[PDB]
């Protein structure tokens, strides 16, 4: 069985990953007074499969470059992103890990390399400049991203994502800790290099510059799967879907609904906002958010103690 449970939890996500690009190229469209892709297939449903086939068939030109730090980079990007769905706790998870959120934080952190490796591998100036800035904001955002989670955990009692289903049986962790949700949402927007915070690989063509066909696709796939995963982590950590032990799927049904809406939100954010400047972006995290996060981090070590609410381990 366990193998079947690996197809499910993977394919299903890959098929959904494909349908996100479509729901991105249509929701951005109607917002901009245009139908979007509807001519290939019925209502554009076959559109994601079509360019996938075009991308893989086109020549994967190897520049006159490394040949490994070039092919390792997309493999790593897809591998980490699809891997991080392993411990996610939809209803009950596939591989329940006692230190689950540290797994998600660590696996995300590893993706910054793929950007670094691809930028060095390309051996062209646009790629290296883009990679250095890209690596900078990714790890810069990781620092507030991690502290925001540590505040959460201390009110959850453990690192296991499964505990939050029992923590959020009466109220979402948005009500409490909303100030961080916002700061988790903005950090989720930075770490998926989505719009407001998408300076790398902008209209300025960073680490796709030299990447075409199959390599382009793999990161590509990775980004979008991440786009979902991070949104899904928002939908478990802060928006806690109702859980009934008798019927486990209403948890997944609402997880489905909240994840799609917050996934819709970063699509909506992209069309709505101009992109921030490179330093504007770091100015936000180190000046605007990190002092807010570190202080609210202390408030979340104090809220438990003097409100005699220290969370139950386990």
């Amino acid at each position: 069985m366990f193998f079947i449970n690996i197809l499910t939890l993977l394919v299903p996500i890959l098929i959904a990953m494909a349908f996100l690009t479509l729901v991105e190229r249509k929701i951005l469209g109607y917002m901009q007074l245009r139908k979007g892709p509807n001519i290939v297939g019925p209502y554009g449903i076959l559109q994601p499969f079509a360019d996938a086939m075009k991308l893989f068939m086109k020549e994967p030109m190897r520049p006159l470059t490394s040949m490994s730090l070039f092919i390792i980079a997309p493999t790593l990007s897809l591998t980490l992103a699809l891997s991080l769905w392993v411990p996610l706790p939809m209803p009950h998870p596939l591989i329940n890990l006692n230190l689950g959120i540290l797994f998600i934080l660590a696996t995300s952190s590893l993706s910054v390399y793929s950007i670094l490796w691809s930028g060095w591998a390309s051996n062209s100036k646009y790629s290296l400049f883009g990679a250095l800035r890209a690596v900078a904001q990714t790890i810069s955002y990781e620092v507030t991203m991690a502290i925001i989670l540590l505040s959460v955990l201390l009110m959850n009692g453990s690192y296991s994502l499964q505990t939050l289903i029992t923590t959020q049986e009466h109220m979402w962790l948005l009500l409490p800790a909303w100030p961080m949700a916002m700061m988790w949402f903005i950090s989720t927007l930075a770490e998926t290099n989505r719009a407001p915070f998408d300076l790398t690989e902008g209209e300025s063509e960073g680490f796709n510059v030299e990447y075409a066909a199959g390599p382009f696709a793999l990161f590509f796939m990775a980004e979008y799967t991440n786009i979902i995963l991070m949104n899904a982590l928002t939908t478990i950590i802060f928006l806690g879907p109702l859980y009934y032990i008798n019927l486990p799927e209403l948890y997944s049904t609402n997880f489905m609904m909240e994840a799609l809406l917050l996934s819709s939100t970063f699509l909506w954010i992209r069309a709505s906002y101009p992109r921030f400047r490179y330093d504007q972006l770091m100015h936000l995290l180190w000046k605007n958010f990190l002092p807010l996060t570190l202080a609210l981090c202390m408030w979340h070590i104090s809220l438990p103690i003097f409100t005699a609410g220290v969370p139950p381990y386990m």
């Binding site: 951005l28 209209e203 300025s204 063509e205 906002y273 992109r275 921030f276 490179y278 504007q280």
Partner: protein
């Protein structure tokens, strides 16, 4: 050379032909030396070998975002040399389509500025309005852009029977469309940052580098050639120049959104007060005879044959006539021998001066800043390269 890189000509940023060599210490720009001529095509030499009426189509191509306003400048220039002036209805038309064209340019400049910045929805919102305007061009000239409607002696053909009404419905609504863009960019917590205090140009420096456009107006210098030196019937209308303070990318922008607003005020009037009359001078000497007349009257055929085959035969002289094209002062210095074909026609391009300023504007600025400043100069490489 501070890892000097050359901004891409194909780059989506830029208007397609800007090889901006930039030596950058990391992400800071030390010096910008724009390269030009990637679109030089010979427009100034070609005109010497063509007659006045067959050189009119070149002007539409000089800066084609602003298709017509450019023609008006050659028109005016050729009319001055002949000491002929267009009929009253034609004048209003030229101001009607002169302004419609200003909107078209500003929708281009504001929305294309945002696309480089990264905001993409304003472009699609206003390109639909643009589209609707093009249709005016087409139903008046025949071409969506590159019309050739404003000729040296007035307009070519009267407005179709019904256009004015539609240039109303549109105008009646376009405002809301500008308003929307606003709710998306004027106060965006982020548009301001990337635009505010970027490329500030002093008032004295703007006059010195010959900026002559919104770029001057944005710095607070009050100069609109349309109010200072009225051309056509822009004197009979009433509009407010949108002067700016704390000149910077954001302020000038606000100015371009404000002239979009003021042009709707000028368009309204033109629709309200356009006179009954003829749309071309009655001198068969300068304007081609009506086709019913050339097919029934000998003097009209002779005048049709000579005008199309040989030309106006402008009296010898030279003139520099400048209008207020949407980008800035567009002027034609047209030296002319008594011949039917011009001798020289230097096109002053608001843009040759503006690009030059890129160096004195983008100093100690990041790569992204350079992208913002090329946008705030509305550089159309056709006018610069000519």
């Amino acid at each position: 050379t501070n890892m000097t890189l050359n901004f891409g000509p194909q780059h989506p940023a830029a208007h397609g032909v800007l090889r901006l060599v930039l030596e950058l210490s990391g992400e800071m720009v030390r010096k910008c030396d724009p390269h030009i001529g990637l679109l030089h095509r010979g427009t100034e030499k070609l005109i010497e070998y063509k007659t006045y009426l067959q050189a009119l189509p070149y002007f539409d191509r000089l800066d084609y975002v602003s298709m017509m306003c450019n023609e008006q400048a050659y028109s005016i220039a050729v009319e001055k040399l002949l000491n002929i002036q267009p009929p009253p209805r034609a004048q209003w038309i030229r101001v009607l389509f002169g302004e419609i064209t200003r909107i078209l340019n500003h929708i281009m400049a504001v929305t294309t500025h945002a696309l480089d910045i990264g905001a993409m929805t304003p472009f699609f919102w206003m390109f639909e309005e643009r589209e609707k305007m093009f249709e005016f061009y087409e139903r008046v000239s025949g071409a969506r852009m590159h019309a050739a409607y404003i000729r040296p002696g007035g307009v070519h053909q009267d407005l179709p029977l019904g256009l004015l009404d539609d240039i109303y419905e549109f105008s009646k609504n376009f405002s809301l469309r500008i308003d929307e863009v606003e709710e998306m960019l004027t106060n965006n917590r982020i548009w301001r940052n990337r635009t505010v205090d970027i490329g500030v140009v002093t008032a004295e420096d703007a006059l010195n580098y010959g900026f002559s456009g919104v770029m001057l107006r944005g710095s607070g210098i009050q100069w609109d050639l349309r109010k200072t030196q009225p051309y056509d019937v822009y004197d009979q209308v009433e509009f407010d120049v949108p002067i700016g303070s704390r000149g910077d990318c954001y302020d000038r922008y606000l100015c371009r959104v404000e002239e979009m607003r003021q042009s709707l005020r000028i368009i309204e009037q033109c629709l309200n007060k356009m006179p009954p009359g003829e749309i071309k001078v009655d001198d068969a000497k300068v304007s081609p005879p009506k086709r019913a007349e050339m097919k029934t009257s000998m003097e009209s055929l002779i005048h049709h044959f000579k005008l199309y085959t040989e030309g106006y035969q402008v009296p010898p002289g030279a003139t520099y006539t400048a209008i207020e094209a949407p980008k800035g002062e567009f002027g034609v210095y047209l030296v002319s021998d008594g011949s039917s074909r011009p001798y020289r026609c230097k096109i002053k391009a608001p843009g040759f001066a503006h690009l030059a300023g890129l160096d004195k504007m983008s100093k100690g600025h990041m790569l992204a800043d350079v992208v913002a400043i090329i946008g705030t100069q509305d550089i159309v490489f056709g006018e610069i390269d000519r």
